[PDB]
Amino acid sequence: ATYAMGSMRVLLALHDRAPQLKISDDRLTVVGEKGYSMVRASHGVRKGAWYFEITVDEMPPDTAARLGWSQPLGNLQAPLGYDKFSYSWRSKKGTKFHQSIGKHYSSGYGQGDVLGFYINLPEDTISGRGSEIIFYKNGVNQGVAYKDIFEGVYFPAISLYKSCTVSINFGPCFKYPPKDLTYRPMSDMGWGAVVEHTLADVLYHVETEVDGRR
């Protein structure tokens, strides 16, 4: 059995997606089609603090997005946040959705906004700091949207209503990196990042062997 390495980079998933969504060749941009449907990223996280960004490239009138995090069982033919498996943030009025229950959260977002998505899943689920989902708008923390979330693997997730266009940035370089929290970029989950980190560590070691350090 060969190691299940997944995709070298974190991208929008090839098959773990609603077939009617239109996904770019580089698998970082997606366009909605008619009623709400969803796509997950190719890697998801189980523990630790993680971050990604989404830019609303175009949002014509009468189009909408619900963006956030989804476990593998989240319904791909429903808006994000429809069931217990996902948590989302709606462009219209900034509502937060989970199990189809929409609650006041923030002001709305739309075309040109760069949104940030933070999740923290502490190792110790009893005495740890507590699990959290936090949304950012153009670098501004919008508050803890959800806490004490269902344990599981969470994938960056995008659901779009009609023909709006968004682009997802998993890292490592973000437009508005949060100033108030630590995190790893979602891009660290691609096995190409593990290769880069392995070599980066080796190069640091070589530098110690050759130059010493002061």
């Binding site: 070298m8 190409g192 880069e196 392995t198 070599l199 190069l203 640091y204």
Partner: protein, 47 residues
């Protein structure tokens, strides 16, 4: 002549990253030889 890490970044790190990536993807039978061959077959694109 640059510092150690700088020197390796400008000479071999880009092609080495690529060979390591192919290595990790394909897990070939003789990885050291496979990596040495990869560096030679692709030297010109980085030389």
């Amino acid at each position: 002549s640059l510092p150690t890490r700088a020197y390796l970044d400008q000479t071999v790190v880009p092609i080495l990253l690529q060979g390591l990536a192919v290595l990790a993807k394909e897990r070939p039978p003789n990885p050291i030889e496979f990596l040495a061959s990869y560096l030679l077959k692709n030297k010109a694109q980085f030389e």
